[PDB]
Design a protein around this ligand. Sequence first.
Ligand SMILES: *[C@@H]1O[C@H](CO)[C@@H](O[C@@H]2O[C@H](CO)[C@@H](O)[C@H](O)[C@H]2NC(C)=O)[C@H](O)[C@H]1NC(C)=O
Ligand SMILES: *[C@@H]1O[C@H](CO)[C@@H](O[C@@H]2O[C@H](CO)[C@@H](O)[C@H](O)[C@H]2NC(C)=O)[C@H](O)[C@H]1NC(C)=O
Ligand SMILES: *[C@@H]1O[C@H](CO)[C@@H](O[C@@H]2O[C@H](CO)[C@@H](O)[C@H](O)[C@H]2NC(C)=O)[C@H](O)[C@H]1NC(C)=O
Ligand SMILES: *[C@@H]1O[C@H](CO)[C@@H](O[C@@H]2O[C@H](CO)[C@@H](O)[C@H](O)[C@H]2NC(C)=O)[C@H](O)[C@H]1NC(C)=O
Ligand SMILES: *[C@@H]1O[C@H](CO)[C@@H](O)[C@H](O)[C@H]1NC(C)=O
Ligand SMILES: *[C@@H]1O[C@H](CO)[C@@H](O)[C@H](O)[C@H]1NC(C)=O
Ligand SMILES: *[C@@H]1O[C@H](CO)[C@@H](O)[C@H](O)[C@H]1NC(C)=O
Ligand SMILES: *[C@@H]1O[C@H](CO)[C@@H](O)[C@H](O)[C@H]1NC(C)=O
Ligand SMILES: *[C@@H]1O[C@H](CO)[C@@H](O)[C@H](O)[C@H]1NC(C)=O
Ligand SMILES: *[C@@H]1O[C@H](CO)[C@@H](O)[C@H](O)[C@H]1NC(C)=O
Ligand SMILES: *[C@@H]1O[C@H](CO)[C@@H](O)[C@H](O)[C@H]1NC(C)=O
Lengths: 534, 29, 29, 131, 231, 223, 231, 224
Amino acid sequence: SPIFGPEEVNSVEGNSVSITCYYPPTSVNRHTRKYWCRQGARGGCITLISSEGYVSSKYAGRANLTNFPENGTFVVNIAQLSQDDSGRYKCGLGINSRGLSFDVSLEVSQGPGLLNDTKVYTVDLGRTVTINCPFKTENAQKRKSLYKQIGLYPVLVIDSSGYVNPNYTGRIRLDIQGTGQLLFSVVINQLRLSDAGQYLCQAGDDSNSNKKNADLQVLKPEPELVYEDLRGSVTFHCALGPEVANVAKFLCRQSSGENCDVVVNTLGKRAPAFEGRILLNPQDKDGSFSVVITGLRKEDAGRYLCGAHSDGQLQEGSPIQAWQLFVNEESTIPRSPTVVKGVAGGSVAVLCPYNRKESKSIKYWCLWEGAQNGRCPLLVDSEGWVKAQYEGRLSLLEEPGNGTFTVILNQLTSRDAGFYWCLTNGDTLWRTTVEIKIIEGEPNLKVPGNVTAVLGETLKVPCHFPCKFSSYEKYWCKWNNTGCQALPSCDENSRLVSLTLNLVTRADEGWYWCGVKQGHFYGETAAVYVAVEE
Amino acid sequence: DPQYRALMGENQDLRKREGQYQDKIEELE
Amino acid sequence: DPQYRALMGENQDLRKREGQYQDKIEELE
Amino acid sequence: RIVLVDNKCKCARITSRIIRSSEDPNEDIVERNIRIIVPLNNRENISDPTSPLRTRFVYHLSDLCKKCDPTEVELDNQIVTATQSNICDEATETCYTYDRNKCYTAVVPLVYGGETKMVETALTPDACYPD
Amino acid sequence: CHPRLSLHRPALEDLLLGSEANLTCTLTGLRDASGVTFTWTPSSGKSAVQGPPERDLCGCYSVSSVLPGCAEPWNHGKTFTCTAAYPESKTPLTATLSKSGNTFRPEVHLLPPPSEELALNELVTLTCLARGFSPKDVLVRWLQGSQELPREKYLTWASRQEPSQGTTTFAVTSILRVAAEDWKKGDTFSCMVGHEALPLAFTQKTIDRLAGKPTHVNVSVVMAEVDGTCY
Amino acid sequence: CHPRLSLHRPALEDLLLGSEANLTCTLTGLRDASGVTFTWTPSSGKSAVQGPPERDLCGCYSVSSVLPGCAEPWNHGKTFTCTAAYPESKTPLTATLSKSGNTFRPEVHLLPPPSEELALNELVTLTCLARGFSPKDVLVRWLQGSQELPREKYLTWASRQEPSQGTTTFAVTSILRVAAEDWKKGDTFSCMVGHEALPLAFTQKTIDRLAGKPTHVNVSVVM
Amino acid sequence: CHPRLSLHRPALEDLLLGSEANLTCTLTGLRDASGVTFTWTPSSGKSAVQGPPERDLCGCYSVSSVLPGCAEPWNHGKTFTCTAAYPESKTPLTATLSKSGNTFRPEVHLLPPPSEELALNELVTLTCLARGFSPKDVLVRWLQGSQELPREKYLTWASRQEPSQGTTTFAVTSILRVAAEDWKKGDTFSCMVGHEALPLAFTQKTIDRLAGKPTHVNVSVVMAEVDGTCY
Amino acid sequence: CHPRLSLHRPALEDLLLGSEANLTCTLTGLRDASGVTFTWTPSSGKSAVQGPPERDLCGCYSVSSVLPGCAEPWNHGKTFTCTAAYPESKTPLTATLSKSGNTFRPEVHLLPPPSEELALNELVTLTCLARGFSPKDVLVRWLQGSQELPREKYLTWASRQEPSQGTTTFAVTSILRVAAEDWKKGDTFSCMVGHEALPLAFTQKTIDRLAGKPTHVNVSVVMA
Ligand SMILES: *[C@@H]1O[C@H](CO)[C@@H](O[C@@H]2O[C@H](CO)[C@@H](O)[C@H](O)[C@H]2NC(C)=O)[C@H](O)[C@H]1NC(C)=O
Ligand SMILES: *[C@@H]1O[C@H](CO)[C@@H](O[C@@H]2O[C@H](CO)[C@@H](O)[C@H](O)[C@H]2NC(C)=O)[C@H](O)[C@H]1NC(C)=O
Ligand SMILES: *[C@@H]1O[C@H](CO)[C@@H](O[C@@H]2O[C@H](CO)[C@@H](O)[C@H](O)[C@H]2NC(C)=O)[C@H](O)[C@H]1NC(C)=O
Ligand SMILES: *[C@@H]1O[C@H](CO)[C@@H](O[C@@H]2O[C@H](CO)[C@@H](O)[C@H](O)[C@H]2NC(C)=O)[C@H](O)[C@H]1NC(C)=O
Ligand SMILES: *[C@@H]1O[C@H](CO)[C@@H](O)[C@H](O)[C@H]1NC(C)=O
Ligand SMILES: *[C@@H]1O[C@H](CO)[C@@H](O)[C@H](O)[C@H]1NC(C)=O
Ligand SMILES: *[C@@H]1O[C@H](CO)[C@@H](O)[C@H](O)[C@H]1NC(C)=O
Ligand SMILES: *[C@@H]1O[C@H](CO)[C@@H](O)[C@H](O)[C@H]1NC(C)=O
Ligand SMILES: *[C@@H]1O[C@H](CO)[C@@H](O)[C@H](O)[C@H]1NC(C)=O
Ligand SMILES: *[C@@H]1O[C@H](CO)[C@@H](O)[C@H](O)[C@H]1NC(C)=O
Ligand SMILES: *[C@@H]1O[C@H](CO)[C@@H](O)[C@H](O)[C@H]1NC(C)=O
């Protein structure tokens, strides 16, 4: 069930094929047995190759299997296919009789050859094609016509006088260039799935009849496989050519109804399910953009298509690119609280996980902004930069340090509700999103309002805490862009952990935090601004 | 008519009889 | 042909084995 | 289908489905599906010489479905950690099958020259390599 | 009427859902006035407020006093020795209270609605029964989905010690009434019980229609003769 | 103590199981001589002799009156107002006595044991729940087959007022622990609720093993 | 004769059940005397020892050297080079070695005694076949119950290369002859195979009178409760 | 290097399935004197044939002599004595070779594949074990159905000596791997052993699927 692969494989005789299959990188999976077998009407998969050194007689010299434990994948290479290599195959792990596998379908079609009388034209869906049809010099001013062999009887699609078939109106043109050119051409733009078939040119109705049959096929885009974990993130790179660099781009998910349900557009649209966990970046000079989706769920699995059309939806005549997505569900990503509730005036501490193998990275905290295509500006980083409007009420700490770091945000307000993103610099990039809400209530720790100080005078500040903060550690720290550090200032019964300043100078002015912590894990905090006057 | 087929048949018969005696010995215990 | 002789030897061995099986079943009763 | 439980200590999977009808309560039905895999080649205790075969498999629905792990609950304004079962005796269950992700090892005494050593043997070799 | 002294342990609601282990010491039988004094041995929170001398039934006086404190020392197993000095006698009398020993943990059960109540399609009754705990203090709460229902929606009884099966144990019950169209839909309801003797002090049990009595069960037995590994 | 007058009602157990159901009109607190004069409006012709005049808790005197010669045959709803006189100031005191209506019948549910208790084969708990009666006066009894069970073999909680929409209703519960072997054997256990509003004054419910027939377990094996 | 140099890998038994990782460099074709000098690429604690000469085939001397205390680099993936210089030489000889790559874990099969051997009821043969591993070195031992039998009780064959159906591999077999009464009483025998490819360097396969085939087993499944509020 | 004369008995393969028999008497450790006269006292039947010296021990010119056609005398029980001389000393060297008695036949066992192999749908292994034969020479071959197999398809080990106490005996084994489809279809397989002590010098054992004791289970589901 956790295995993935290409559902269908197409090839012609004489060429090699390569099939990549994915498994979770668990150690048992890395060190167990990988096989490639072929099923039949008997119900039993007959192993054709294995990772332990077995190579069937039929597959000797041609096929081989390579396992990449770091990737989580293994690749089967086959060569010299034939019409007999068409059927149903399976990836898998461990024993055959069990169900830890994935079904693939191989179809081999006869190759071309000796058919020089008919040409071939292959173009991408929704892209321009051109067909040059020579005509004999004996015909100087004669009607040039193109016929599409449709059904029992051929019909006419375009003449040289301006008669265009309804099915091709507005996008098919005929050109007879000058400069002593004795060849005519037909140019078709925004190709469609039905435009493929057999064409034939004709130069007048005279006995000459310099015809030339041609063939045209429009290619569908092969999906790119993507294998992602639960509550992780995925990135789609839509890299259509510069020819459509100034058209509205869209990303949709094909469904059972053969109809895209748009996920995102560039005209300012978005689905309600992807609120707070979607991003659409601006495109570069080449004309490629990226789409980020975090917090992947069980229902984010299926075909995706990115295209460029004027109306921002899926319509014929627009180039498209296809992805297939798999959500593992056997994920090792730690579970975290998706919804965090804070009380107006209180504080919040958020635990953001990352990969334990990249503990020397840089960590970032961001706030998702809608009302656009999507954005995520920075608030605090792990190097000593904080926003100008968040000074005195935000901090990042790498204190847990086992694939987790804390972010502390106090002085909450009703405007702080929203979606926040945690980021790092590593190659394995989970993006974790947390929704902060605001409710009515009172802070637990109680500190006075703004405190004034007289130059060269002792000062004392209290900090009351409730009866449940008696088994914790109480601390006072001084806030700084690089993080606050505990002071060697007092304590009592369940109240009055106090800060003392013997002599006050202008440097002592700033913001101080009174907080509690259970050694490694932090909790509620309360901020007081200590000023200095003269 | 070849000898080998008849020898194979006799061998198969003796093998089946041996299996039956094998079952009978064990069932007694 | 060695193979035919080997088959005959196997037949003789199996016949002796089943004879010993009969002797073994006799005593157990 | 919603998978109520899966159990590797005894290899039992229980799922439930609901099929309602527009009219009347009786037409509505609730179905439960139970899948059991019964091994036939491992011992009573998972150690080498023990009870040449295990031939008595006993399944209690209450034992299969138990959830021996804590949970977080937000009652009024705080989050509290709560247990989830009464059968959480404190690792002694008599598992019937090997968990595919865990590895089970034995200890054997072998004589090397004029001495003796205690070597460690892997019953399931794929389950855990030294990583 | 007659002198008497008593020490009351802190309530479980404040002790568990919080940390305020306030203690109360009460004396009954005031002669003529409220000329009485109290003394605890852990004189840490000396600010023990003394309330007004409330009267009693048909001409009697009682005096109660409160000593605040957090739950850490109480859970650690300290001892308190309130002593009164009523003027009706020249000899004070003392009372001692300490954390109870020889505890047990409750066995929570959550029962599904009865069949006869489901055909009428009006309302369903969910029953929570906690059993077999030695101390008489316990908390019962209900939750719909993952949200706590207000205290006025369910009915909770008190703790009555059950007939002696060897030792002393207790029991408590509560019931909740839910819309039948909500039970049939497939929502989940949880009963949470809190006791001093539980390892985490809380234990919950969640039930819904899928985890109830099914009207059809399919049992399939698979024999795996190759190996037992439960892929 | 402060003088006062109280009026009681016959015990439900006496009403539904006894032929000596006698009302009571008591004077709590006495600080005078035998100056008690009690009168009851009904004049059927029974005896209204004074009960046992004695003292109460904390230095109080009280005189009680009963109707031993009558079994309380007041189904028709006799007001049975009590009038009392004392040697104190000329302000005779009476008592408030009436038969309030609004009679709702209890609904009784007998629940089977939880399955976890059945997996240990020690003891099983059967629960009885009576719900939805306006007169907050009910008695619960248990039977094993036909034999009754002494009141020391089961627990019963007090009758509380359950939340409702407008109409008031009361609820009560009880539990009985029985040997798992007997329950598995198939002995029937019944809960009986006695209440005023009932026509026969008793509602019986029964439960035993294999009470749920329609379950349709299906079995099939492979290889 | 013709001088030659070679390197001998550490014995498998010493590496698996020992602590001295001695690697030996052997030199042959001594002419008249032994004035050779040996050295290795590393020297951190390289207590190289030469020792007295010996006798070679056809009449000749050959003095070898040893290098202990190299287990950690050997397992980590180091390469060892021994270079020697004899007096009657113009260019020192050299030899190099490293741990083998592309190793395949063996497949162990314990085959129960042939059915004809269990009727004569004198002795029975248990066969342990290890198959499909790349390096040649391997060990085979036996246990009855939990105590190993002496090595002079069974017969083990040399590791050999088998026909190719893909990559190259090896194979080995061992046999034990045991009393029929012990088998029919209900004793269990285990075969232990020791190879560098296996996870913990050792694996075992056990067999008794009933394992290896059902042959009219009797299995009972109860499935006590199936409609019981599974939560 | 050092003079040494050795006698080699006729090879079993030729003695069994062949016609001619080799009888080898070889001298090693001379490095000179190629004119060594290999004289056999039982000079009957055929004639002794010499051979050119070969580089042996990197310091000797080993010279061997063959006495072909002596299969019948070897089987009858005629003792063969080889006599040679060297110029190093005046003492000629004489060696003797004769057949040994107390011959015991081998016991051959063919074992079906392990039950854990059929689950992979790859080849399956069949083991043939010959045990208990006194002379240390034996040859093992295989057949699939009726058609023999080439020697490059199965592996066999050398005939080692087993740890007994009564008498000296030897053992040998071999394995053949066959397609799972052939095994499941119903095709039979066999392993043949050839040894001196057998009256016919050739026996074999046969294995095929669905042979032996039945293996069906009887399960009882209670459901309480
Ligand atoms: C994961 O798979 C990819 C794809 O095969 C590997 O990347 C290629 O590896 C081959 C051979 O190592 C190189 O020739 C290519 O240049 C690599 N890049 C591409 C785009 O094919 C990758 O090496 C695998 N993972 C690891 C850890 O090796
Ligand atoms: C206490 O004094 C500080 C210092 O001025 C106040 O903090 C600033 O308030 C202004 C007014 O809203 C903001 O524009 C600044 O961004 C705040 N920070 C700084 C560093 O100037 C604070 O509002 C005062 N009151 C309290 C309750 O702290
Ligand atoms: C199953 O067998 C294992 C074999 O290791 C038992 O565990 C060992 O038991 C012995 C006997 O008490 C102890 O000396 C060892 O220390 C145990 N080993 C370990 C790793 O704990 C186990 O107790 C057996 N289980 C049952 C239920 O009999
Ligand atoms: C325990 O006793 C303390 C001491 O009186 C109580 O704290 C007081 O609570 C009242 C009501 O909330 C406040 O008005 C006072 O200011 C508090 N005084 C102090 C010193 O904190 C506390 O509420 C009691 N706890 C419980 C659960 O009743
Ligand atoms: C496997 O085969 C492919 C082509 O068939 C080849 O490029 C690759 O090097 C091979 N890998 C191995 C390990 O043989
Ligand atoms: C034009 O398209 C329609 C679409 O249904 C089709 O029926 C018709 O045959 C087409 N005609 C030509 C000339 O392609
Ligand atoms: C937690 O950190 C300690 C020390 O940094 C480390 O030994 C331990 O393995 C870590 N825990 C996990 C689960 O990684
Ligand atoms: C504290 O902040 C000031 C500026 O606000 C900076 O100059 C100083 O280096 C900081 N010190 C620490 C310890 O963060
Ligand atoms: C390795 O060499 C040391 C040094 O002589 C010796 O003590 C030890 O026994 C040797 N170990 C072997 C040969 O396994
Ligand atoms: C064992 O299985 C057989 C089925 O062949 C059955 O007849 C018998 O009752 C079962 N129990 C015993 C003890 O044999
Ligand atoms: C002796 O052996 C050789 C090869 O070793 C072989 O050619 C010859 O046929 C055998 N027999 C005789 C009589 O030489």
